[PDB]
Amino acid sequence: DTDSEEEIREAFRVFDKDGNGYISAAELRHVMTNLGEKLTDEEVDEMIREADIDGDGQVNYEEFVQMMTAK
Ligand SMILES: [Ca+2]
Ligand SMILES: [Ca+2]
């Protein structure tokens, strides 16, 4: 709850460039690339796709967490 899950809630919240309240695949490639690491769009696009429960190109913090670790 507030033990540490908070940092996760933050990092992901700030991540949403368009502060839409969720996370899209386009933001990952741009932000990661902007951060200094240029990932692969094919992996990114596929990344969320697998970590998507609603199937709306948008995933909250958890739906993502379970992914962040898994490569
Ligand atoms: Ca988003
Ligand atoms: Ca989803």
UniProtKB/Swiss-Prot annotation:
It is found in: Cytoplasm, Cytoskeleton, Spindle; Cytoplasm, Cytoskeleton, Spindle pole; Cytoplasm, Cytoskeleton, Microtubule organizing center, Centrosome; Cell projection, Cilium, Flagellum. It is linked to Ventricular tachycardia, catecholaminergic polymorphic, 4: An arrhythmogenic disorder characterized by stress-induced, bidirectional ventricular tachycardia that may degenerate into cardiac arrest and cause sudden death. Patients present with recurrent syncope, seizures, or sudden death after physical activity or emotional stress. CPVT4 inheritance is autosomal dominant. Long QT syndrome 14: A form of long QT syndrome, a heart disorder characterized by a prolonged QT interval on the ECG and polymorphic ventricular arrhythmias. They cause syncope and sudden death in response to exercise or emotional stress, and can present with a sentinel event of sudden cardiac death in infancy. Residues 3-38, 39-71 form the EF-hand domain. The modification N6-acetyllysine is found at residue 17. The modification Phosphothreonine is found at residue 33. The modification N6,N6,N6-trimethyllysine is found at residue 38. Calmodulin acts as part of a calcium signal transduction pathway by mediating the control of a large number of enzymes, ion channels, aquaporins and other proteins through calcium-binding. Calcium-binding is required for the activation of calmodulin. Among the enzymes to be stimulated by the calmodulin-calcium complex are a number of protein kinases, such as myosin light-chain kinases and calmodulin-dependent protein kinase type II (CaMK2), and phosphatases. The modification Phosphoserine is found at residues 4, 24. Changing residue 52 to G: In LQT14; reduction in calcium affinity; not changed protein abundance; not changed structure; significantly decreased thermal stability in presence of calcium; significantly decreased RYR2 interaction; increased ryanodine-sensitive calcium-release channel activity; decreased of KCNN2 calcium-activated potassium channel activity; not changed KCNN2 expression; not changed KCNN2 location at membrane. Homotetramer. Interacts with MYO1C, MYO5A and RRAD. Interacts with MYO10. Interacts with CEP97, CCP110, TTN/titin and SRY. Interacts with USP6; the interaction is calcium dependent. Interacts with CDK5RAP2. Interacts with SCN5A. Interacts with RYR1. Interacts with FCHO1. Interacts with MIP in a 1:2 stoichiometry; the interaction with the cytoplasmic domains from two MIP subunits promotes MIP water channel closure. Interacts with ORAI1; this may play a role in the regulation of ORAI1-mediated calcium transport. Interacts with IQCF1. Interacts with SYT7. This is Calmodulin-1. Residues 1-71 are annotated as: Necessary and sufficient for interaction with PCP4. The chain holds residues 79 to 149 of 149 of the full protein. Ca(2+) 4 binds at residues 52, 54, 56, 58, 63. Ca(2+) 3 binds at residues 16, 18, 20, 22, 27. Ubiquitination results in a strongly decreased activity. Phosphorylation results in a decreased activity.
